[PDB]
Every structure is written in C-alpha cells, then in structure tokens.
Amino acid sequence: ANDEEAYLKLLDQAKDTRITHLLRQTDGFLKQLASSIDYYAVAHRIKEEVTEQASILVGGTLKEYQLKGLQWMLSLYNNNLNGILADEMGLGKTIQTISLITYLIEKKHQQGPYLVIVPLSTLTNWNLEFDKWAPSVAKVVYKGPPNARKMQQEKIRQGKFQVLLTTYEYIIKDRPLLSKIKWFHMIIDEGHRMSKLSATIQQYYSTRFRLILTGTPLQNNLAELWAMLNFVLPNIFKSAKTFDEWFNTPFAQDKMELTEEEQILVIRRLHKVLRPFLLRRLKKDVEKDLPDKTEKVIKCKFSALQARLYKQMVTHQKIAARGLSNMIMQLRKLCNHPFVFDEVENQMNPANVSNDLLWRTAGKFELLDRILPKYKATGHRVLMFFQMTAIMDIMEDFLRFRGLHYLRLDGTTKSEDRSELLRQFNQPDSPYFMFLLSTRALNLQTADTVIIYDSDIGQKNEVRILRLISSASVEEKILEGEQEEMDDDELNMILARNEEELAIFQKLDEERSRDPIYGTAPGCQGVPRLMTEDELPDIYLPVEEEVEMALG
Ligand SMILES: C[N+]1(CCCS(=O)(=O)[O-])CCCCC1
Ligand SMILES: C[N+]1(CCCS(=O)(=O)[O-])CCCCC1
Numbered sequence: 001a002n003d004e005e006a007y008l009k010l011l012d013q014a015k016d017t018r019i020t021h022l023l024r025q026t027d028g029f030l031k032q033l034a035s036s037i038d039y040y041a042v043a044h045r046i047k048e049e050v051t052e053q054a055s056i057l058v059g060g061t062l063k064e065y066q067l068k069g070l071q072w073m074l075s076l077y078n079n080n081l082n083g084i085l086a087d088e089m090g091l092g093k094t095i096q097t098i099s100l101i102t103y104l105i106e107k108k109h110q111q112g113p114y115l116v117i118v119p120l121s122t123l124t125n126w127n128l129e130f131d132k133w134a135p136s137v138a139k140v141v142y143k144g145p146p147n148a149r150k151m152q153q154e155k156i157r158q159g160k161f162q163v164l165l166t167t168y169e170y171i172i173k174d175r176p177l178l179s180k181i182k183w184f185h186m187i188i189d190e191g192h193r194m195s196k197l198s199a200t201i202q203q204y205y206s207t208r209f210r211l212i213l214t215g216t217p218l219q220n221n222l223a224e225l226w227a228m229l230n231f232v233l234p235n236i237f238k239s240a241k242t243f244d245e246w247f248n249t250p251f252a253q254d255k256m257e258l259t260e261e262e263q264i265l266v267i268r269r270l271h272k273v274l275r276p277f278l279l280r281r282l283k284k285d286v287e288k289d290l291p292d293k294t295e296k297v298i299k300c301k302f303s304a305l306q307a308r309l310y311k312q313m314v315t316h317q318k319i320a321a322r323g324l325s326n327m328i329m330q331l332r333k334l335c336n337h338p339f340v341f342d343e344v345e346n347q348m349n350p351a352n353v354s355n356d357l358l359w360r361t362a363g364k365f366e367l368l369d370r371i372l373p374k375y376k377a378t379g380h381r382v383l384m385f386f387q388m389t390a391i392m393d394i395m396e397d398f399l400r401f402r403g404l405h406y407l408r409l410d411g412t413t414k415s416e417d418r419s420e421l422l423r424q425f426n427q428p429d430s431p432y433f434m435f436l437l438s439t440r441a442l443n444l445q446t447a448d449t450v451i452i453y454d455s456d457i458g459q460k461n462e463v464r465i466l467r468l469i470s471s472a473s474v475e476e477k478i479l480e481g482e483q484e485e486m487d488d489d490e491l492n493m494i495l496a497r498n499e500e501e502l503a504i505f506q507k508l509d510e511e512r513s514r515d516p517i518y519g520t521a522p523g524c525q526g527v528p529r530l531m532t533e534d535e536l537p538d539i540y541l542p543v544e545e546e547v548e549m550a551l552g
C-alpha cells in the first residue's frame with residue numbers, strides 16, 4: 001500500500017496508543033478498587049469465617065484447605081466479586097465448587113440456578129460428584145443428541161432445577177434456549193488445560209456471579225490472560241474479541257507486533273489486575289491434609305469394532321418385560337469387550353491365540369495397556385473389580401500376554417482358597433501386581449489403587465479409585481465434536497500421586513513413542529493403538545445371528 005518504509009513509526013505510534021490505552025484503563029480499575037498497595041485486602045474487605053460445610057453437602061468432610069477455599073469463594077460472593085480458583089490438581093476443586101453451591105443454597109437461600117460448564121471429558125465425573133456430595137440439589141445434565149435435549153427443554157424452561165451441568169458446545173449451539181435463563185452463578189471448569197465461547201457468554205448470557213476453575217497459575221500467554229480478564233472483569237474493556245483482534249483493531253492492514261519487553265509489560269499488568277481475584281494453593285503446602293481416597297471416572301473410547309457392533313445392536317433393538325433388560329446386557333458386554341461374544345472372537349481371532357487383538361479391540365484394555373505399567377513402575381498394586389465374570393477370562397489372557405502377575409477370586413473360589421489368595425496378596429514382597437476380583441464374591445490393604453472395570457483397601461496411603469466408563473454408551477446412562485476422552489498428559493496428571501511418579505509416567509510415554517509398531521517417532525510405523533475401520537472386513541454394517549446377538 002502507501003508504505004514508505006519509514007512509515008513504520010505509524011505502526012509504532014498506533015502500538016503506543018494501544019498499549020497506553022490498556023495501561024490507563026487497568027490503572028483506572030485498580031485506582032478505583034483502592035479508592036473505596038494491598039488490593040486483596042480492599043477487594044475482600046467483608047469477612048465471613050467458615051467453620052463447617054453445609055448440612056446438604058453429604059458424603060465426606062471437607063479438608064481444612066477446602067474449608068478455606070470455600071471461605072474464599074464465599075468472600076467473592078459477599079464482596080460482589082468474580083474469581084478464579086487455581087488450586088493445583090489433586091486439591092478437589094470439583095468438591096470445593098459443590099461446597100460453594102450447597103453453602104449458598106443452604107446458608108444464603110440462593111436456590112439458583114447455577115450454570116456449570118465443564119470439559120466433555122469430565123462431565124460424567126462432575127455428574128457423579130454431584131450425586132454423591134449434593135443429592136438434594138436438583139440437577140439437569142444437558143448433553144447428547146437434539147432429541148435427548150428436547151426432553152430437557154420443558155424442565156429447563158420452567159426453571160424446575162437448580163444446577164444445569166453442560167459443556168462449552170451446548171452453551172454455544174443451544175444459546176437461544178440457555179441464554180433466556182437468568183443465571184445466579186456461572187462456573188467454568190477449564191480443566192488443567194486452558195474461542196467462540198467467550199464471545200457467546202459476553203453477549204447473551206446473564207449471570208450474577210462468575211467463577212473460573214483452572215489448574216495452573218496465571219500464565220505468560222496474552223491470549224489466555226486476555227480471555228480470563230474479560231470473563232472475570234468484563235467492564236474494563238467490554239470486548240469479546242481475542243487479544244490479537246483487540247490489539248489490532250486500529251487496522252481493521254498488518255499485525256502490530258509487541259517487543260519482548262512490551263509483552264512482559266502487558267502480561268504483568270494483567271496479572272496484577274487479576275491477582276486479588278485468584279486463589280491458588282499447592283499440593284506441597286497441604287500434603288499433610290490431602291484426603292484418604294479420591295475417585296475419578298475415566299472415559300474410554302470404543303474401538304472401530306465396538307463402535308460397529310454397538311450401532312448394529314442398537315439398530316436391531318429399536319425394531320423390537322425383562323427382554324429389554326437382556327438388550328441392555330448385550331450393549332454392556334460390548335462396552336466391556338467384543339470378544340465376550342464367541343462369534344466375534346472366532347471371526348476376529350480365528351487363530352485363537354493371545355496377541356495385540358486383546359487390547360486393540362477394546363477401549364478399556366487399550367487404556368489399561370498404557371496405565372498398568374505406569375502403576376507397576378511406581379510401586380503400586382491394583383485391585384480390579386468386575387461385574388461380568390466373563391471379562392475376567394479375557395483379562396487373564398491379556399495380563400498373561402503382557403507378563404503381569406495377578407491373582408483371581410470369584411464366586412467359584414472355594415472358601416479355603418479365598419483366604420490363601422488374600423494371604424498371598426497381602427504379603428510384603430508379593431510378586432503379584434494385581435488382584436482380579438468379582439464384585440459378587442475383604443481386607444486388601446497392601447493395594448492403594450482400585451479399578452472398577454464396570455458396574456450395575458490401603459494403609460495410611462493415598463488410595464485412588466478409577467471407574468472406567470465407555471464414552472457415549474449405555475454405561476453412562478447406568479452411572480446416572482469435543483474430545484470425549486483425555487490424552488496421556490492429562491491422564492498422567494490425575495493418576496500420578498507426586499512429582500517423582502509423573503516423571504516416571506512421562507518417561508514410559510516417550511518409550512512408547514519410540515515403539516517400532518505403535519510409536520510416532522521417525523522410523524516407527526505409527527500403527528494406531530485402537531483398531532480402525534480399515535482393519536475391519538464387511539461385517540456388522542439382514543443377518544439373523546447378528547440379531548440374536550443384539551437381544552440375546
Ligand atoms: C451480595 N450480598 C447481597 C446480594 C443480595 S441479592 O438478593 O441481590 O442476591 C451482599 C453482602 C451480603 C451477602 C450478599
Ligand atoms: C469482579 N467485579 C465485577 C462485579 C461482579 S459481577 O458478577 O456482577 O460481574 C469487577 C469490578 C469490581 C469488582 C467486581
């Protein structure tokens with residue numbers, strides 16, 4: 001264009017005007033906060049001590065640091081503030097949030113409604129924590145296909161609920177329905193991790209209070225800080241655009257660039273403005289008070305074989321009083337392992353041998369294939385509960401195939417064998433890494449890790465309980481686009497107990513990264529871990545033996 005190159009002073013004159021603008025607005029905000037330097041003390045000038053959780057927070061006593069977290073979020077309410085709970089992973093931000101909701105309901109008579117927006121991969125966990133910790137709090141889970149969400153719209157429109165639990169996707173897609181509601185509180189769980197969503201909330205959603213859950217401290221990313229600032233403190237700049245868009249609106253045409261020191265200049269001011277509204281405690285400073293056992297739901301993918309069989313079964317079933325209970329059972333066999341159907345095993349594994357098909361065909365086995373070595377490599381010992389005995393046979397084949405030493409106990413086990421199996425497992429130097437247990441058939445306090453494979457311990461140790469659930473399956477309903485599951489890094493974050501283990505977990509993830517078959521390093525085949533559609537013949541896509549399978 002008209003760029004006589006010495007005009008670069010024109011971009012710089014615009015950048016200086018834009019930076020100066022950002023500094024004076026944030027200075028005005030801080031000047032105002034201090035007029036009514038310790039900005040925390042002046043922001044939280046109204047105190048209220050919290051000594052005990054609400055009576056309706058049932059099923060667990062808050063830890064001391066969780067009580068102080070509840071007290072801090074209550075200070076946001078009393079002082080008419082928005083805020084950010086940035087506690088490190090493992091401090092129970094989910095539980096603290098439910099403690100805030102119950103406390104506001106019980107003590108302050110704030111019935112709701114409460115808007116809780118969570119990563120799809122943790123939705124099921126959230127739903128479960130609400131059922132355990134706050135059963136009296138009326139809850140709507142807003143997810144699924146459009147015909148499943150229409151059944152909610154009546155209850156939602158009438159306001160006959162207190163908590164609406166949903167994901168970012170439906171906040172955007174179903175805004176015409178959800179933005180009609182006058183929300184009391186909007187809580188956004190950004191996971192540990194942290195586009196369109198911020199604009200949708202800024203323009204259409206009416207809430208009286210806002211809270212962000214994050215797992216990291218305030219970062220050095222301008223885009224993320226900017227998005228946080230404009231959600232927590234929307235009136236300073238009143239813009240739904242990203243930082244880059246906001247910064248470059250003068251030329252709405254080349255991107256104005258900030259020097260390294262200009263970026264740091266902007267980052268520190270945005271940090272300073274947000275600090276009085278941020279609470280973050282570290283695991284190392286509350287280590288003595290950390291809880292006894294914590295439970296996490298882990299969502300698992302379907303393999304292409306499971307997905308194919310599942311769609312076919314469901315279709316055949318809709319064509320058709322406990323014959324409906326049988327259909328539900330068939331879907332549950334699939335979610336556990338396709339090979340529980342003998343016909344599927346014969347077609348897929350005609351050689352009738354133990355190989356990588358054991359874990360490539362079942363999303364739960366493929367997950368266990370990754371995390372069981374991590375536990376083994378960090379000194380832990382695993383109890384595994386099964387509702388279906390038939391899956392225990394397949395698990396035995398897989399464990400033997402991986403060389404993992406286990407014991408097994410079910411209703412077939414004779415009474416004197418049960419005691420001997422327990423005695424062996426409880427031994428100090430037991431070579432047995434795992435205990436396979438039928439839930440129908442105990443003092444297993446040498447194991448600190450518990451995996452509930454499906455559904456219908458520990459000595460002074462952090463006991464961890466994992467509940468495996470197939471995404472988008474009948475298993476989700478029984479427990480009652482966006483990435484349905486979490487990746488290895490996020491998985492390492494919630495399975496590792498300290499920093500020494502997280503390093504061990506990551507070292508194993510890099511060793512797998514260089515596997516000749518499944519690795520993604522250069523010189524590796526890059527074969528997918530879960531079976532893919534191209535690996536399947538034209539089966540289960542009319543055929544009688546496949547309808548008996550669906551309703552058996
Ligand atoms: C925030 N506040 C008053 C708000 C009361 S309201 O009914 O509008 O929700 C002020 C300090 C006392 C505790 C609650
Ligand atoms: C956080 N905030 C906003 C008011 C709280 S509100 O939920 O209504 O948005 C901003 C400036 C003063 C301190 C309160």
Ligand SMILES: C[N+]1(CCCS(=O)(=O)[O-])CCCCC1
Nearest residue numbers: 265267268269270271272273
């Ligand atoms: C750089 N900073 C924040 C420094 C951190 S402070 O200790 O002062 O709170 C932000 C922009 C204005 C000048 C102070």
Ligand SMILES: C[N+]1(CCCS(=O)(=O)[O-])CCCCC1
Nearest residue numbers: 354355356357360517527528
């Ligand atoms: C190539 N391969 C071989 C797996 C090795 S196995 O021990 O299970 O035989 C089989 C096809 C899927 C990708 C892995």
Ligand code: NA
Nearest residue numbers: 198227228231
């Ligand atoms: Na946001």
